[PDB]
Amino acid sequence: VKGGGISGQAGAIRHGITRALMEYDESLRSELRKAGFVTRDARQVERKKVGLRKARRRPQFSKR
Amino acid sequence: RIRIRLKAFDHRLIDQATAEIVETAKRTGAQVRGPIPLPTRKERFTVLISPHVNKDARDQYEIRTHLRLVDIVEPTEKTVDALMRLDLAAGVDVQISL
Amino acid sequence: AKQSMKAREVKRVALADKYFAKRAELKAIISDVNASDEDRWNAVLKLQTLPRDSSPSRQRNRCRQTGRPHGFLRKFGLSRIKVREAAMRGEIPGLKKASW
Amino acid sequence: GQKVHPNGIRLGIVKPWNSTWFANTKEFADNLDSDFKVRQYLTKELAKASVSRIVIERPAKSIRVTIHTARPGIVIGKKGEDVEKLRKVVADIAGVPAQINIAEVRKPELDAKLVADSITSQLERRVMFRRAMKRAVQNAMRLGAKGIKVEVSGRLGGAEIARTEWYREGRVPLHTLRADIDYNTSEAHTTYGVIGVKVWIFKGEI
Amino acid sequence: RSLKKGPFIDLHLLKKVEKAVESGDKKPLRTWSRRSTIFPNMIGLTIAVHNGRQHVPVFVTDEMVGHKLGEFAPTRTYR
Amino acid sequence: RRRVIGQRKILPDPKFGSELLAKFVNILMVDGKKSTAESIVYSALETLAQRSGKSELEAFEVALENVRPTVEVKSRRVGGSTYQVPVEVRPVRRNALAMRWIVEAARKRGDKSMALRLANELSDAAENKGTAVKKREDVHRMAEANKAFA
RNA sequence: GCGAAGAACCUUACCUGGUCUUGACAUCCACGGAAGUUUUCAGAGAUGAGAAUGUGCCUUCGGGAACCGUGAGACAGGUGCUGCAUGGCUGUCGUCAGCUCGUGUUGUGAAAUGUUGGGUUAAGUCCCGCAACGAGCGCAACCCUUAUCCUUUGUUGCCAGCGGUCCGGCCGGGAACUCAAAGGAGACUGCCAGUGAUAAACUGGAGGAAGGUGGGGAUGACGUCAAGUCAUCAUGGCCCUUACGACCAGGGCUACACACGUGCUACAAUGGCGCAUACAAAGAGAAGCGACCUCGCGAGAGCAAGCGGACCUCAUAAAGUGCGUCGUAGUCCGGAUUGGAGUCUGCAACUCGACUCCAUGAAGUCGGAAUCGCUAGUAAUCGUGGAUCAGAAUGCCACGGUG
RNA sequence: ACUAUGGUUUUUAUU
């Protein structure tokens, strides 16, 4: 393994182990099919919204 | 190891040299090295949409990097001077390398 | 913007042609102080302030598209208040959208 | 304004543009100043010569233009050399020697800028215009339109309110991303006030 | 202080320092020199320094050298 | 407005062996280092267990079973008057709440490290003890202010 | 923290002495001469005098042209005033689903109707149905993009397979895997079964780049407020024109009689202090970014490699983690307005810039009733860059780490 | 509904 943070390296290794078990046996190509370990997750970052510094915590700026 | 990488700034002006970058290589010699993938820089600019106040919204624009290697594969000076004083496209900059 | 300001906007480089635009490549070699107690060149740096309403710093461009000196984009030759309308019209070399 | 303009984002993506040239950062504003001033010159000389668009190119140490018209004969004029008198002005504005040529545009009553030039006169003269608008629509729908709209704003019925009067056929959608709309704005002046007229044409997607 | 090796010198005042050598009794002269410094080889004549609406007469002592003419002619009436 | 995408469920904790502890390391989460979760497991399992609960299989779970919230109060109208009306606590909140309130008293001791100062107040919850038990006891007293309705 | 990603002069409305009047920038009747190049004097300078030297190559009685300067009358010029005058630009309820027209019916008539009812949806969304029948505008749909596939190309990258090896991507060179583009495909409740007015619509399974608005965005109905803007302009009024125009040399715009809307860092100890360490993008870079190295406590300066950026540099990301240490205290906490002393740039840093080293260690013991933000890569919480430009951002915008 | 209970904001150029 090379590149990126060690908690992402771990996630790429569970994918690699599942793809290697899929090369080993015709029963593993079934028993691992829907386990979710080759099914790429989406925690996809939203387009940065003006005029917020970070994410969704809205600044006060209101009274008057 | 001498390189002559071509850089464009308008994507429609490098769409005029798409064949001539291969014909130049087949006219100067026989090996073709024009094409190359390379990392693209987005070269982004972001701007306000209201001329006054209203800093609540901004819109994004791009120019990107369009790059072709060209390269030199011929040692003969009557061909090296034709590649070092070369023409292919308009609105361009050329990166000479050692 | 006043017509007097629209004229200063060009006059502030039209004589810099003679004094700075072909001389200021030597701003560290000829135009910079080097001697202590006994200068030997020996009063030539005053010739850099001899022309009227004109200096290497006063070469400021302001903005040609609109009457605002601030809010200019030098790499596209436009003001930020007109650059969208011009980039939608396609007038700007190389600058475009898709989209974001 | 409100409701998306065909000269706005609709032209800012995937469409070709009439000026096609480059410039370095040390003189970029005079390159944009000349592009405006040469087209502003030519579009006013040819104001009654059925002109629609003008393209601009900048070859090395030169400038080159093409003028698109539905009447080449009035633009090329006497002896077939009446465009040469235009070079001497645009070469002063650009600072470089100028090249000029023309091109014939087909189906004139299908271009929004030449259709506007068939109806602005009727408002300027203060004459009956509802059949001029029927003709403007029916001639475009005969030539090859898939939709057309025309709308007048100013002095209608001698009122003081911001009221409009129109004629349409085939439906011209503006909120469609791909519809490639041809849109002209026109205005006339009279001893009873100014009168505006807008023309929108649809021919197909992309 | 310094300025770019050795003291700042200001020329439209200096053309009088060159003649007051040979100094004497005269009226205080109007001067627009506000960044000029009070060094012992540039001082010699009576002067009135500009404040942005008037010229005010100013005088210096033997124990001061690290100062500028504008500090003897303040531009504020206060409030 | 009832249209929601949250509404998450829990499963038994892999190291605490219980559904009643399934949220124990996940509450009041801050700055993502998750250093309490790594420092609270096994390293307090024989120093919290001193006098309460029978065997390691309940001697930590007792600190979430011996202390019980039973009632929660909010003002409501009945028959012709307003009262502080209680609602009786269900099994899905019976055990997984009272460990959310000891973080106040655990910040009045001068006691070192988050896991060990928290477990020292949780060690008292196994015998129904605590400093300022307001969020359990002051609502129980208010749920005795009226005891019959309509 | 707005116009403005910068401000000594300049910018600039405000303002004070000097000063020009057909105007710094024009057009109409006229009009002088190489465009250029040096240099002197009064004066703060504007300004006013000059003192000298440039005439191409053609060629017709001639005369060219950049830039300067003139003879009459109209005028020129104006961050002067006026968005209750007009075109353009633009805000928000709201990205809410709503607003209406032609003809028939009813009523004497303003109008009422349809758009209401009945299913259903994010949605006047989709269907059913009536004295209503038909219809436009907006809604949803294109496109941008993400999980995949088809396809092509490869150094300055990456470096396995092949030969040689300063045994090293090092020399030849190539695609293990992967970085890396540049161009196309396609999703339709389509298929299966259940509910429903077998309509519309809703709910599981099969197989998916993505299901049943897949996720995230763009667009701004009719209008409200006669919404802010002549500080970009256009352009009609009201006014100034030996001036409120244009300038030189300087005050300011960073005043202070005294009040608001927000923000940051601490009032500890999942906190500080010291030492050694894991793993990121993204961006700018020839008066630029500056390596190796020396000098000073340090800003920064010096010698000086690379060079238009997958290359060299800005520039050993920080929190996180280990190993040592300090303790429940106004503290090793906390760092503030003056004080001592340097560095850098420039016409010039007292008033009016930014960085750096020393001394002080104040106030701060959780705020006066009272008030406010956020529901999944969200709350949390710690770093990083850039525009301007001779001279610097506790801002603004963008990108990651951890959740 | 157990929220025991309540007053102003100029006539005058305008929506």
Curated annotation (Swiss-Prot), chain C:
InterPro entries: Ribosomal_uS14, Ribosomal_uS14_bac/plastid, Ribosomal_uS14_CS. The keyword Ribonucleoprotein applies. PROSITE patterns: RIBOSOMAL_S14. One of its GO terms (cellular component) is cytoplasm. The keyword DNA-binding does not apply. HAMAP family: Ribosomal_uS14_1. Part of the 30S ribosomal subunit. Contacts proteins S3 and S10. Belongs to the universal ribosomal protein uS14 family. Binds 16S rRNA, required for the assembly of 30S particles and may also be responsible for determining the conformation of the 16S rRNA at the A site. This is Small ribosomal subunit protein uS14. It comes from Escherichia coli (strain K12).
UniProtKB/Swiss-Prot annotation, chain D:
SUPFAM superfamilies: Prokaryotic type KH domain (KH-domain type II) (SSF54814), Ribosomal protein S3 C-terminal domain (SSF54821). It comes from the Bacteria. Keywords: Ribonucleoprotein, Ribosomal protein, RNA-binding, rRNA-binding. InterPro entries: KH_dom, KH_dom-like_a/b, KH_dom_type_2, KH_sf_prok-type, Ribosomal_S3_C_sf, Ribosomal_uS3_bac-typ, Ribosomal_uS3_C, Ribosomal_uS3_CS. SMART domains: KH. The keyword Ribosomal protein applies. GO terms for cellular component: cytoplasm; cytosol; cytosolic small ribosomal subunit. Residues 38-106 form the KH type-2 domain. One of its GO terms (biological process) is ribosomal small subunit assembly. One of its GO terms (molecular function) is mRNA binding. CDD domains: KH-II_30S_S3. HAMAP family: Ribosomal_uS3_B. Binds the lower part of the 30S subunit head. Binds mRNA in the 70S ribosome, positioning it for translation. Plays a role in mRNA unwinding by the ribosome, possibly by forming part of a processivity clamp. Part of the 30S ribosomal subunit. Forms a tight complex with proteins uS10 and uS14. With proteins uS4 and uS5 encircles the mRNA as it enters the ribosome, which may play a role in mRNA helicase processivity. Some nascent polypeptide chains are able to cross-link to this protein in situ. In collided ribosomes contacts ribosome rescue factor SmrB. PANTHER family: 30S/40S RIBOSOMAL PROTEIN S3, SMALL RIBOSOMAL SUBUNIT PROTEIN US3C. Belongs to the universal ribosomal protein uS3 family. This is Small ribosomal subunit protein uS3.
From Swiss-Prot, chain E:
One of its GO terms (molecular function) is structural constituent of ribosome. It holds the Pfam family Ribosomal_S19. Gene3D superfamilies: 30s Ribosomal Protein S19, Chain A (3.30.860.10). One of its GO terms (cellular component) is cytosol. PROSITE patterns: RIBOSOMAL_S19. GO terms for biological process: cytoplasmic translation; ribosomal small subunit assembly. Keywords: Ribonucleoprotein, Ribosomal protein, RNA-binding, rRNA-binding, tRNA-binding. It comes from the Bacteria. In the E.coli 70S ribosome in the initiation state it has been modeled to contact the 23S rRNA of the 50S subunit forming part of bridge B1a; this bridge is broken in the model with bound EF-G. The 23S rRNA contact site in bridge B1a is modeled to differ in different ribosomal states, contacting alternately S13 or S19. In the 3.5 angstroms resolved ribosome structures the contacts between L5, S13 and S19 bridge B1b are different, confirming the dynamic nature of this interaction. Bridge B1a is not visible in the crystallized ribosomes due to 23S rRNA disorder. Protein S19 forms a complex with S13 that binds strongly to the 16S ribosomal RNA. Contacts the A site tRNA. Part of the 30S ribosomal subunit. Binds S13 and L5 and cross-links to the A site tRNA. Belongs to the universal ribosomal protein uS19 family. PANTHER family: RIBOSOMAL PROTEIN S19P FAMILY MEMBER (PTHR11880), SMALL RIBOSOMAL SUBUNIT PROTEIN US19M (PTHR11880:SF8). NCBIfam families: rpsS_bact. This is Small ribosomal subunit protein uS19.
Swiss-Prot record, chain F:
GO terms for cellular component: cytoplasm; cytosol; cytosolic small ribosomal subunit; membrane; ribosome. One of its GO terms (molecular function) is structural constituent of ribosome. Changing K34 to A/E: Defective in ribosome assembly. Keywords: Ribonucleoprotein, Ribosomal protein, RNA-binding, rRNA-binding, tRNA-binding. GO terms for biological process: cytoplasmic translation; negative regulation of translation; ribosomal small subunit assembly; translation. Part of the 30S ribosomal subunit. Contacts proteins S9 and S11. Cross-links to IF3 and the P and E site tRNAs. Belongs to the universal ribosomal protein uS7 family. This is Small ribosomal subunit protein uS7. It comes from Escherichia coli (strain K12). The lineage of its organism: Bacteria, Pseudomonadati, Pseudomonadota, Gammaproteobacteria, Enterobacterales. The gene is rpsG.
